[PDB]
Design a protein around this ligand. Sequence first.
Ligand SMILES: Cc1cc2nc3c(=O)[nH]c(=O)nc-3n(C[C@H](O)[C@H](O)[C@H](O)COP(=O)(O)OP(=O)(O)OC[C@H]3O[C@@H](n4cnc5c(N)ncnc54)[C@H](O)[C@@H]3O)c2cc1C
Length: 498
Amino acid sequence: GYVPAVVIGTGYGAAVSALRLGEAGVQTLMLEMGQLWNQPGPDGNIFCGMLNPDKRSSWFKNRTEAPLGSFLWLDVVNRNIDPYAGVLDRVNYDQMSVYVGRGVGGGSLVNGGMAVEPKRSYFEEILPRVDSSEMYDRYFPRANSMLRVNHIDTKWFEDTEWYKFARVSREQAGKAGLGTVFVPNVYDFGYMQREAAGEVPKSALATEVIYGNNHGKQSLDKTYLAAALGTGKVTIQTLHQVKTIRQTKDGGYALTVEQKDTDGKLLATKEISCRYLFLGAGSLGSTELLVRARDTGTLPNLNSEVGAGWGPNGNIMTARANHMWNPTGAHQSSIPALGIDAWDNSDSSVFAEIAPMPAGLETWVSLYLAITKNPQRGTFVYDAATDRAKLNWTRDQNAPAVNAAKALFDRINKANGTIYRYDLFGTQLKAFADDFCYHPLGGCVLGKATDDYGRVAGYKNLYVTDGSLIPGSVGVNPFVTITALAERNVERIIKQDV
Ligand SMILES: Cc1cc2nc3c(=O)[nH]c(=O)nc-3n(C[C@H](O)[C@H](O)[C@H](O)COP(=O)(O)OP(=O)(O)OC[C@H]3O[C@@H](n4cnc5c(N)ncnc54)[C@H](O)[C@@H]3O)c2cc1C
């Protein structure tokens, strides 16, 4: 049936959009292909931890997988599983694997909570058509407040065993003349203190993050989406995947929507129509819907920029072997708190999160997720044969990202007389993982596929809201940017269009 506004997905762009629509009095239906994560599972918890993965860990796979970097220690806990509507989806393209959340809250369910504003001068470089003053004066602050961003207590951080890993990398980076920064987070750091004191159930301190956190993490279901539901004007239907979008003969948009069970069985196909259609299906999902619509002739006026301009936020993972006298600790909080900021907007830029490892015993490894400035971009191209968007990225396109990460970590190795690990990402010697992405950005780029507020070119009342808007790179963990840009966009769209 008909609803005034439909929002596809329930990640950051979607959640912001739905809240503001509901506050404006616009009845809004959100369609989410994954689950509402609120049912206790076989262990009494909603989510599985990293040491006990089960079918809840994975979107329709037949075996669990170790978190990247951890195979040498966590393969032992892997098990065959039933394909199920689990929370983390590794999406495999030709030469790139992109990890995304599936559920009410999208990637907020599975991410590390790291809530970081981009450098203003870099924002101005990547999005020159956008007014940076309103972003920094108004929209970024609004996003941080509504996301429930908070800051770790420095004394607790300095003293706790749970962050020894971070302090070790800080000291090592310092010998190379590199500084660290604290990283704000949506995980409640007060709660985390009480976890360490044995006062509340552990989550971050029980090797949970990438398959969800049972406690502590303020994912979007607790923040924006709870508020959206609270308006009385928003509803969320789960296990509903939008497949096609067309412009109706009499006005607005019509969607074909598959309803499935948690085993993936098709229960129904429904037609849902609307006046205003907002895409918040992510870089991958929104772009796929639009390349499909263009190439199958249901939105034939979409432009050639739909599909273009994708990048992995320069994501590269690497690891160093510490000296025996610098153990990183058996107990590592699953929520990172420190990064190495070597980002100056030049091609050598690196912003690297000091990543915990989940092994739960001493390994002497320091792990890093580097964000780099690599101009290479990929394109999503529709394959009509399989009805899928395929990402045309090749592994060699990550060479500039590897080069920048390697130059930075080579400085740290030289200053400390340490070497890389080469064995964490497969049997072949490989110090830099260069074919994964946690931060997919682009495919429907702001000002290219859309106007400067995400209005899709060629169409009225059709909007993209999410990471597909970002031109491939923000230089930091992306969700605060996605949220702030969505605040800007929906506020303008409601004022001018609704
Ligand atoms: C392991 C990991 C760690 C990360 N750590 C951080 C971090 O600490 N900080 C940070 O800033 N970022 C982090 N990220 C990235 C961040 O989570 C994403 O950038 C962000 O979630 C993207 O928001 P979005 O709104 O574009 O889409 P998403 O959050 O991906 O949401 C899209 C939603 O749409 C749904 N959907 C897709 N297609 C359809 C369809 N056709 N029909 C219906 N529903 C659909 C999906 O199931 C999903 O729920 C991390 C991500 C991962 C995977």
